[PDB]
């Protein structure tokens, strides 16, 4: 593996430098097993409640385009079901779907004045899932134990990455208008072969309205002055991490607009966006609306909500200030 | 992006246009990405391994004061280290120096009568290193499949642009004296953070000796009359092309100095040259002579020699023609 090597020589000062050697993330991680990484074995669920003895972290979820990060805790955990869950909503929030979790490494990651250690899984296709970072608030007694019971000298070579679908026409705003959890419609999307983005462009403007590129910038600002809770949501194909709470700062820099939080920080690339909309989704509990954020190839940056949880209604202050983008 | 839009009014009738906007080359292309252009992904490797598989093209690689145009194919490739290569002398001839390579789009050259294909290559700078036109003898049947294969949705935004140094004196000239290959010039620069002419400026004349700007104009009237083979080559911080043969036509137009070729053309900016200089490097077979002009910036406009490859000395005929320099 001359990827270890050139790994170094390309060490800018890694999800870029395995970009600029077009090779996934794992691939990098996987050339690193002997030297600043180790690869672990067994159940991913026994992995993740394991974390619970840990004490506080700092987890980082993404995709091409933002990266969300919370401090918090694995505590509060269900996962016996095939998408887990780890429900503390003012501070650690994911949902994960496992059956896209593949492999999983413990990595140093460099540092100047010292070390970082984390935990990091990656997919099955090679790209980053969830990083798991140790702070300064750590049980690293715990953390060495967790890492003891998991390291493996295995190391094997990684691999690679069904359902019926029916005629569309607008049988899709009928569909749609029949959820009872936002989360219903992926199937729908995976039940007519549809882009988020193509189910848009075909329901009627109160279930989808395409908004300026300036609808973050705008939303946040507003969140901001009225101080009113608000939630954010980033995710990529096997994890999603959801912040609960009152925005502090904003702060934008050159591209990247970012949120800066005692608990929560967000860098999101505000250029890359393509298409920003508003949607009206169905709830056992009303219609919720939130905006949603796209790349050009159709990636979705990024969603947000007003805070909001099972049999509540959201806010009016949050319906005000979103309804002010679609009069 | 007012990009498309303006690039689009500024149309006079890309490098240019751009320029105007006080903006990079790669960014112009970028904003053209669904209109004519697409943006293209993957390993730039295979990208030019696959080249290959089409057959005749035309091939512009170029500076700011020079382009250089030959038409051959995409044989004989060595592409597996930093610096790789397409070995085909009396054609298409070119060392590309990987790390330099950033991004690539396919674009339909706005034609008058019809339209243009081509493949292009940025720097990190924005700045174009290749230029791969389709010509009326290419297979549009694999230039197609190579398309299809490489083309993508992404359009992620752009971005940007280490060596221990000694001392200098004259250990300069006694480090060039050692060179067994005229690359090792760069090296040496590196090693002391000299410009070229800072070190033609520092060693001796028969090293190096500044020549009137009338040089090039002199020595291709000298080729054209004599008939001897002759190779020019023409560069930017990420590209070298090079012709070898035999000079015809030299045509020179209102500050341009043209050489119209049946498979090669030149066009440099006859006005642009500041300074000329005949240099002396060593070779494992010898020393070779070459012509090298620069523009007020210091930029190498081009540099001339006589026809040669490795263990084969300069021809005499050349060293008579070059000689006659510098009596």
Same mark, same amino acid.
């Given at each position: 593996?001359?990827?270890?090597?050139?790994?170094?020589?390309?060490?800018?000062? %890694?999800?870029?430098?395995?970009?600029?050697?077009?090779?996934?993330?794992?691939?990098?991680?996987?050339?690193?097993?002997?030297?600043?990484? *180790?690869?672990?074995?067994?159940?991913?669920?026994?992995?993740?409640?394991?974390?619970?003895?840990?004490?506080?972290?700092?987890?980082?979820?993404?995709n091409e385009y933002?990266?969300?990060?919370?401090?918090?805790?694995?505590?509060?955990?269900?996962?016996?079901?095939?998408?887990?869950?780890?429900?503390?909503?003012?501070?650690?929030?994911?949902?994960?779907?496992?059956?896209?979790?593949?492999?999983?490494?413990?990595?140093?990651?460099?540092?100047?004045?010292?070390?970082?250690?984390?935990?990091?899984?990656?997919?099955?296709q090679?790209? %980053?899932?969830?990083?798991?970072?140790?702070?300064?608030?750590?049980?690293?007694?715990?953390?060495?134990?967790?890492?003891?019971?998991?390291?493996?000298?295995?190391?094997?070579?990684?691999?690679?990455k069904?359902v019926?679908t029916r005629a569309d026409a607008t049988v899709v705003e009928?569909e749609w208008?029949?959820m009872?959890?936002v989360h219903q419609f992926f199937t729908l999307l995976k039940r007519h072969n549809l882009t988020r983005q193509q189910a848009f462009n075909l329901v009627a403007d109160?279930l989808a309205c395409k908004v300026?590129n300036?609808?973050?910038?705008?939303?946040?600002?507003? %969140?901001?002055?009225?101080?009113?809770?608000?939630?954010?949501f980033?995710g990529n194909r096997?994890?999603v991490?959801?912040?609960?709470?009152?925005?502090?700062?904003?702060?934008?820099?050159?591209? *990247?607009?970012?949120?800066?939080?005692?608990?929560?920080?967000?860098?999101?690339?505000?250029?890359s966006i393509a298409e920003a909309w508003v949607t009206?989704k169905?709830?056992?509990?009303?219609?919720?609306?939130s905006l949603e954020l796209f790349a050009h190839d159709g990636t979705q940056i990024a969603q947000?909500?007003?805070?909001?949880?099972?049999?509540?209604?959201?806010?009016?202050? *949050?319906?005000?200030?979103?309804?002010?983008?679609?009069?």
């Amino acid at each position: 593996m001359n990827h270890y090597t050139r790994w170094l020589e390309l060490k800018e000062q %890694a999800r870029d430098i395995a970009g600029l050697m077009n090779i996934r993330e794992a691939e990098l991680a996987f050339a690193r097993v002997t030297h600043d990484a *180790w690869r672990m074995h067994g159940d991913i669920r026994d992995i993740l409640a394991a974390l619970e003895s840990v004490g506080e972290t700092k987890c980082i979820c993404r995709n091409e385009y933002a990266v969300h990060e919370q401090v918090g805790t694995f505590t509060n955990q269900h996962l016996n079901g095939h998408a887990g869950l780890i429900l503390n909503p003012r501070a650690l929030d994911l949902r994960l779907f496992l059956n896209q979790w593949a492999s999983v490494f413990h990595i140093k990651e460099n540092t100047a004045r010292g070390e970082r250690q984390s935990i990091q899984f990656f997919d099955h296709q090679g790209d %980053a899932l969830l990083k798991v970072y140790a702070t300064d608030n750590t049980d690293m007694a715990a953390w060495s134990e967790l890492l003891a019971r998991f390291i493996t000298d295995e190391n094997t070579p990684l691999e690679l990455k069904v359902v019926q679908t029916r005629a569309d026409a607008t049988v899709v705003e009928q569909e749609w208008r029949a959820m009872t959890d936002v989360h219903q419609f992926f199937t729908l999307l995976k039940r007519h072969n549809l882009t988020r983005q193509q189910a848009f462009n075909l329901v009627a403007d109160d279930l989808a309205c395409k908004v300026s590129n300036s609808a973050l910038a705008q939303i946040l600002e507003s %969140a901001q002055q009225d101080g009113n809770e608000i939630m954010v949501f980033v995710g990529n194909r096997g994890c999603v991490q959801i912040f609960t709470g009152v925005v502090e700062k904003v702060v934008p820099m050159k591209g *990247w607009l970012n949120i800066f939080n005692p608990t929560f920080t967000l860098h999101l690339l505000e250029e890359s966006i393509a298409e920003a909309w508003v949607t009206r989704k169905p709830t056992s509990d009303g219609y919720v609306t939130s905006l949603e954020l796209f790349a050009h190839d159709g990636t979705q940056i990024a969603q947000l909500y007003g805070q909001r949880t099972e049999g509540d209604q959201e806010q009016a202050q *949050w319906r005000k200030q979103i309804a002010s983008l679609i009069p």
